[PDB]
Design an enzyme around this catalytic site. Structure first.
Site, PDB file in Angstrom:
ATOM      1  N   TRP B  14       0.161  -2.943  -5.621  1.00 36.93           N
ATOM      2  CA  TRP B  14      -1.112  -3.378  -5.086  1.00 36.93           C
ATOM      3  C   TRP B  14      -2.276  -2.571  -5.667  1.00 36.93           C
ATOM      4  O   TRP B  14      -3.264  -3.152  -6.109  1.00 36.93           O
ATOM      5  CB  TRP B  14      -1.072  -3.379  -3.550  1.00 36.93           C
ATOM      6  CG  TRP B  14      -2.312  -3.926  -2.851  1.00 36.93           C
ATOM      7  CD1 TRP B  14      -2.913  -3.398  -1.736  1.00 36.93           C
ATOM      8  CD2 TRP B  14      -3.106  -5.068  -3.223  1.00 36.93           C
ATOM      9  NE1 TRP B  14      -4.017  -4.138  -1.391  1.00 36.93           N
ATOM     10  CE2 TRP B  14      -4.155  -5.175  -2.279  1.00 36.93           C
ATOM     11  CE3 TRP B  14      -3.020  -6.025  -4.235  1.00 36.93           C
ATOM     12  CZ2 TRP B  14      -5.105  -6.185  -2.330  1.00 36.93           C
ATOM     13  CZ3 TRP B  14      -3.978  -7.015  -4.291  1.00 36.93           C
ATOM     14  CH2 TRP B  14      -5.007  -7.089  -3.351  1.00 36.93           C
ATOM     15  N   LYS B 108      -1.989  -0.143   4.567  1.00 35.02           N
ATOM     16  CA  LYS B 108      -1.771  -0.820   5.865  1.00 35.02           C
ATOM     17  C   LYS B 108      -0.729  -0.021   6.646  1.00 35.02           C
ATOM     18  O   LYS B 108       0.303   0.343   6.111  1.00 35.02           O
ATOM     19  CB  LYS B 108      -1.252  -2.255   5.656  1.00 35.02           C
ATOM     20  CG  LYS B 108      -2.172  -3.135   4.813  1.00 35.02           C
ATOM     21  CD  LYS B 108      -1.553  -4.508   4.529  1.00 35.02           C
ATOM     22  CE  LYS B 108      -2.434  -5.317   3.602  1.00 35.02           C
ATOM     23  NZ  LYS B 108      -1.856  -6.610   3.190  1.00 35.02           N
ATOM     24  N   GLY B 135      -5.452  -8.646   3.523  1.00 39.01           N
ATOM     25  CA  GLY B 135      -5.201 -10.084   3.578  1.00 39.01           C
ATOM     26  C   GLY B 135      -3.883 -10.454   2.927  1.00 39.01           C
ATOM     27  O   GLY B 135      -3.138  -9.565   2.489  1.00 39.01           O
ATOM     28  N   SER B 137      -1.916 -10.997   0.168  1.00 40.12           N
ATOM     29  CA  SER B 137      -2.168 -10.701  -1.230  1.00 40.12           C
ATOM     30  C   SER B 137      -1.020 -10.072  -1.984  1.00 40.12           C
ATOM     31  O   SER B 137      -1.066  -8.869  -2.248  1.00 40.12           O
ATOM     32  CB  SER B 137      -3.350  -9.745  -1.282  1.00 40.12           C
ATOM     33  OG  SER B 137      -3.065  -8.600  -0.497  1.00 40.12           O
ATOM     34  N   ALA B 139       0.860  -8.575  -4.807  1.00 40.35           N
ATOM     35  CA  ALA B 139       0.282  -7.921  -5.990  1.00 40.35           C
ATOM     36  C   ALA B 139       0.539  -8.693  -7.285  1.00 40.35           C
ATOM     37  O   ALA B 139      -0.355  -8.814  -8.126  1.00 40.35           O
ATOM     38  CB  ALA B 139       0.802  -6.459  -6.093  1.00 40.35           C
ATOM     39  N   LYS B 190       2.125  -6.095  10.911  1.00 39.50           N
ATOM     40  CA  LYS B 190       2.749  -7.210  10.205  1.00 39.50           C
ATOM     41  C   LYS B 190       4.109  -6.923   9.564  1.00 39.50           C
ATOM     42  O   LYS B 190       4.965  -7.797   9.562  1.00 39.50           O
ATOM     43  CB  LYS B 190       1.838  -7.783   9.139  1.00 39.50           C
ATOM     44  CG  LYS B 190       1.528  -6.802   8.045  1.00 39.50           C
ATOM     45  CD  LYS B 190       1.636  -7.473   6.749  1.00 39.50           C
ATOM     46  CE  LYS B 190       1.526  -6.493   5.614  1.00 39.50           C
ATOM     47  NZ  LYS B 190       2.206  -7.116   4.433  1.00 39.50           N
ATOM     48  N   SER B 253       8.609  -9.950  -0.114  1.00 38.54           N
ATOM     49  CA  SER B 253       8.397  -8.943   0.901  1.00 38.54           C
ATOM     50  C   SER B 253       9.627  -8.058   1.028  1.00 38.54           C
ATOM     51  O   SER B 253      10.675  -8.520   1.501  1.00 38.54           O
ATOM     52  CB  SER B 253       8.111  -9.637   2.245  1.00 38.54           C
ATOM     53  OG  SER B 253       8.009  -8.709   3.321  1.00 38.54           O
ATOM     54  N   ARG B 254       9.494  -6.801   0.624  1.00 39.29           N
ATOM     55  CA  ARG B 254      10.582  -5.840   0.712  1.00 39.29           C
ATOM     56  C   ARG B 254      10.978  -5.520   2.152  1.00 39.29           C
ATOM     57  O   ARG B 254      12.121  -5.156   2.420  1.00 39.29           O
ATOM     58  CB  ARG B 254      10.184  -4.558  -0.012  1.00 39.29           C
ATOM     59  CG  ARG B 254       9.955  -4.812  -1.492  1.00 39.29           C
ATOM     60  CD  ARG B 254       9.313  -3.674  -2.219  1.00 39.29           C
ATOM     61  NE  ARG B 254       9.199  -4.018  -3.629  1.00 39.29           N
ATOM     62  CZ  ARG B 254      10.146  -3.796  -4.532  1.00 39.29           C
ATOM     63  NH1 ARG B 254      11.284  -3.208  -4.188  1.00 39.29           N
ATOM     64  NH2 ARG B 254       9.941  -4.145  -5.792  1.00 39.29           N
ATOM     65  N   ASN B 255      10.019  -5.624   3.068  1.00 46.28           N
ATOM     66  CA  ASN B 255      10.278  -5.352   4.476  1.00 46.28           C
ATOM     67  C   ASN B 255      11.090  -6.503   5.046  1.00 46.28           C
ATOM     68  O   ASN B 255      11.973  -6.299   5.856  1.00 46.28           O
ATOM     69  CB  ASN B 255       8.991  -5.118   5.229  1.00 46.28           C
ATOM     70  CG  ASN B 255       8.342  -3.826   4.845  1.00 46.28           C
ATOM     71  OD1 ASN B 255       8.903  -2.759   5.070  1.00 46.28           O
ATOM     72  ND2 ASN B 255       7.164  -3.905   4.257  1.00 46.28           N
TER      73      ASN B 255
END
Lengths: 325, 326
Positions: B14, B108, B135, B137, B139, B190, B253-255
């Site tokens: 990011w 975040k 937002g 986004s 990367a 989030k 999303s790694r999470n």
């Protein structure tokens, strides 16, 4: 109690999934359709192969051909026909129902005269107990007994309790919502927004662009809700946000699939024929767009989709205008 | 308006993508990384192979390994390190702040001690002009110049104006938002929800169940925001709903992939080792859980995720307790 049969009008995927949810609990269910050939297939096969194959009907679930017969002895009716046929079905029910008839629906959209479906029910059938069921509910996952949650708004407490008693179980859950207007309006706009995000995805604009479009979508849904007296709490609930995120993001979403075809250059006619059911999104776009003009409400995503369908607007150009203010 | 260089602290995906957005417009940008062997790689190669391969740097983008050197002649700073490293970076910036320094961040999550990021910045560096950019986004999509929209909240109107002027453009759009606290808190929850929804998907509970969990997620996110004075408009905007839907449904999303692994039965240790690079969701869960308990804030999804991580709670049972609500 809960011994009287329940009639479900409309044998699309969702009507059938709901019939299954109830029939499996031992409740008697009568599944009617105005498509005679389809009823023949169901009566002969004991399954709904054209809309929900691989899920045989239990014994308590039977398909009906005759509307009168399906309503004889029934006091509770659950309507799940396409938005374009709702008024026509209500009209046909008028001389067949009686004093104690209660009317629920899972149909999403508006009816002629730019009216919410409950107004059509009230006009034609008088002031009767009414309820709307709505939330993130892919019919195939419900059929497969995967966890699902929907909202249920009603103008009658007993009717709400009764419906929740029939439907609410471990994996299919129904939560009360006191905002019928907002549930109906959110439901009538979400498919339109899924066509728009589908178009974006078809154009390979990316996940970021889709998320932005979903956010802008909820904003215009919100505006429509406020103008008609719905509640912003509905907007962020199952019937608004819930159904919206599912329908705009899932590969099993047929309205998204349709949008995606359009984004890839397929014409609307060929795109619908290839899908094979009822893309409510098409009908909802026209319904909502007319309501928005009648009341001078700004709804940019809805307006662009309408231009794409009726004015040959280029999909790429359409989405670009939306993201770039 | 862009005579001076802007410094970006954090050379992750990011941070680097933001550096490209600005450097591509011809603005001078200095990108700093605390991993020293990393700056050598970027200086030699002219690209960030560790975190954003295939996107070469424009001539106006330069990597620095020295914090002091990166901030010499620079007064506008944009921090984009993980939440678990924010405190450390702020601490190290203390001897480098000047009279007109302005600090923005893309980070975040809460910082060490369950601290809001603006509070760490204000308390430790003084009440400088501050801003948060947040937002939906990814990367990689920003680097590819795909349409993206993010919110930007600030405690200073001139700073907001200057940042939007630098960042806002055709495919990368930045919208003014008046609720820094709401934006921060939305962003700090989030990834916790991404783990939760990832777990449900790992258990193959389906898309309906995921949507129901996203809906519940937004409700507790709203409660937290509400208790700290944030706005609902933020909740249904890019920093709330936008980023949440993106993070709860994407493969990138790694999470979420971590959650998927947990749902499939993988132990948290092996799941993170397989991913390799550190993720923020576990840290976010721990910080928010502590904050929720300090202020008696009910956050059911966050609490269940915490139980899954620290109390050996079985994932299937955990998600079924969340879904089978009254």
């Amino acid at each position: 109690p809960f011994k009287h049969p329940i009639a479900i009008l409309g044998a699309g995927s969702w009507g059938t999934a709901l019939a299954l949810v109830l029939a499996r609990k031992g409740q008697k269910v009568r599944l009617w359709s105005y498509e005679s050939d389809h009823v023949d297939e169901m009566q002969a096969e004991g399954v709904n192969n054209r809309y929900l194959p691989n899920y045989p009907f239990p014994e308590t679930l039977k398909a009906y051909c005759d509307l009168k017969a399906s309503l004889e002895g029934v006091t509770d009716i659950l309507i799940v026909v396409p938005s374009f046929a709702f008024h026509e079905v209500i009209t046909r029910m008028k001389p067949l129902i009686d004093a104690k008839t209660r009317i629920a629906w899972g149909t999403k959209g508006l009816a002629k005269g730019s009216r919410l479906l409950h107004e059509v029910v009230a006009t034609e059938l008088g002031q009767v107990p009414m309820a709307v069921i709505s939330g993130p509910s892919l019919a195939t996952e419900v059929a497969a007994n995967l966890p699902t949650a929907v909202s249920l708004a009603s103008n009658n407490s007993q009717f709400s309790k009764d419906l929740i008693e029939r439907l609410h179980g471990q994996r299919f859950r129904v939560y009360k919502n006191d905002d019928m207007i907002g549930v109906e309006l959110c439901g009538s706009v979400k498919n339109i927004l899924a066509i728009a995000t589908g178009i974006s995805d078809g154009l390979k604009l990316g996940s970021n662009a889709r998320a932005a479009l979903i956010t802008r979508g909820l904003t215009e849904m919100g505006r429509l809700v406020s103008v008609f007296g719905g509640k912003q709490e509905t907007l962020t609930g199952l019937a608004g946000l819930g159904d919206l995120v599912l329908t705009c993001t899932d590969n099993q979403s047929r309205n998204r699939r349709f949008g995606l075809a359009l984004g890839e250059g397929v014409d609307k006619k060929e795109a619908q024929q290839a899908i094979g059911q009822a893309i409510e999104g098409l009908y909802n776009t026209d319904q909502v767009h007319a309501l928005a003009q009648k009341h001078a409400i700004e709804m940019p995503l809805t307006f662009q989709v309408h231009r794409i369908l009726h004015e040959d607007l280029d999909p790429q150009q359409a989405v670009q205008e939306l993201l770039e203010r």
